Design a protein around this ligand. Sequence first.
Ligand code: 7LP
Ligand SMILES: *[C@@H]1O[C@H](CO[C@@H]2O[C@@H](C)[C@@H](O)[C@@H](O)[C@@H]2O)[C@@H](O[C@@H]2O[C@H](CO)[C@@H](O)[C@H](O)[C@H]2NC(C)=O)[C@H](O)[C@H]1NC(C)=O
Ligand code: PLM
Ligand code: NAG
Lengths: 98, 267
Amino acid sequence: QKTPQIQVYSRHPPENGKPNILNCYVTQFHPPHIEIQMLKNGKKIPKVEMSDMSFSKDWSFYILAHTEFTPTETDTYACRVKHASMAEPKTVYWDRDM
Amino acid sequence: NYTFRCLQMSSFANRSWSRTDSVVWLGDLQTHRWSNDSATISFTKPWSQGKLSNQQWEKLQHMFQVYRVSFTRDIQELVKMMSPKEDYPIEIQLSAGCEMYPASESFLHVAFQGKYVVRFWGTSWQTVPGAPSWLDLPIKVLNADQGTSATVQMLLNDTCPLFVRGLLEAGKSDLEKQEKPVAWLSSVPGHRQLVCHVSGFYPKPVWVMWMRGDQEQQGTHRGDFLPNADETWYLQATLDVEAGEEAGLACRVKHSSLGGQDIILYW
Ligand SMILES: CCCCCCCC(=O)N[C@@H](CO[C@H]1O[C@H](CO)[C@H](O)[C@H](O)[C@H]1O)[C@H](O)[C@H](O)CCCC(=O)NCCCCCCc1ccccc1
Ligand SMILES: *[C@@H]1O[C@H](CO[C@@H]2O[C@@H](C)[C@@H](O)[C@@H](O)[C@@H]2O)[C@@H](O[C@@H]2O[C@H](CO)[C@@H](O)[C@H](O)[C@H]2NC(C)=O)[C@H](O)[C@H]1NC(C)=O
Ligand SMILES: CCCCCCCCCCCCCCCC(=O)O
Ligand SMILES: *[C@@H]1O[C@H](CO)[C@@H](O)[C@H](O)[C@H]1NC(C)=O
């Protein structure tokens, strides 16, 4: 079993009030069964698109999730992953400054 | 040089549940998908048939349709034959294709539970050194099947480089596309980390550095290449700076799409 790594990043420079796309890239996991949610203020975002799962030279799996979002000064966004390698779901927050 | 990779992922949960899914890549662009749900292979580019005729493509597809069923049956029979020594769940991965040179070389590697165990080489299947010894007998049995051996030889020696030559021609405008990076600066927390974000560029090769005038800042820490959903790339590079020393810093980005005019952003 290999534990997923999660990276959360925007497609375009973030501007408050302006529509954008938020990406959640999940890598380095095995086995391939996984649940990926993207969250806005802690609530699941319904319209999340997923790439086809693939794998790297080292055999570990990866997949890209993305969703439309409009960042504001006060909204928080995150990506939460459930996988057999972890007893607890792993959450990574988007931080525009990070 | 382009590497063409056909990636198969098979999960066997028990005797009544399995799926096999595949994706195909030419370099970093996905050319095909074949979901367990679909009877046929799906094109993910307009040019994913390459220069093969409808007849040649359908012949090739039919062979794969037979293989997917046969493979699933073969693995299920092996697990029944070997129970309780080896048992569910089982993950099997195959990576097959070729790498093109100015000439070509083909490969077919197989992983079991995430570990490389078997390859096809020359005219036969072989276990790699350190592979579990219980694989030797089923590989012997598979090597007795000369029809399959000849088919794999044709696919690796002939079909792969042929097919790829046609993909490169048919997909030329996409493989040689240029998309410009857009960059932006931010920072996270007497030190702080400055972040230079670069997004939307294609092809993958890029140069990103923190600068003070024409002096490269060797503290520049480049992240990994991360995909965007629109077949462009994202990369960021960070710099740890002492508060006070932030003045005079810039991020410089070089990329093939910019026509010799680097992006320079000032902190
Ligand atoms: C990616 C490889 C290219 C696939 C080409 C296979 C041709 C094929 O479909 N042929 C199967 C049926 O063949 C029968 O009909 C053919 C004509 O249609 C011929 O006449 C052939 O002689 C005849 O037998 C055949 O059953 C084959 O065994 C299908 C499975 C192929 C297979 O275990 N390949 C090895 C890759 C997996 C090896 C994993 C080893 C392993 C085992 C357990 C755990 C981990 C790893
Ligand atoms: C197909 O080519 C192989 C040799 O090519 C290598 O293995 C392939 C599967 C592929 O991965 C290539 O990129 C590799 O370079 C032939 O096998 C050789 O055959 C000769 C005699 O004719 C034999 O003496 C060699 O030992 C074999 N080579 C090896 C490395 O084992 C094979 O015969 C070709 N088959 C057809 C149908 O064309
Ligand atoms: C399996 C290696 C084949 C090498 C020859 C390449 C021929 C073109 C392949 C077209 C798409 C194949 C998609 C299915 C892949 C699979 O099931 O392994
Ligand atoms: C995968 O495809 C096979 C063949 O059509 C089918 O029988 C099987 O139920 C599918 N598996 C899943 C999990 O849907």
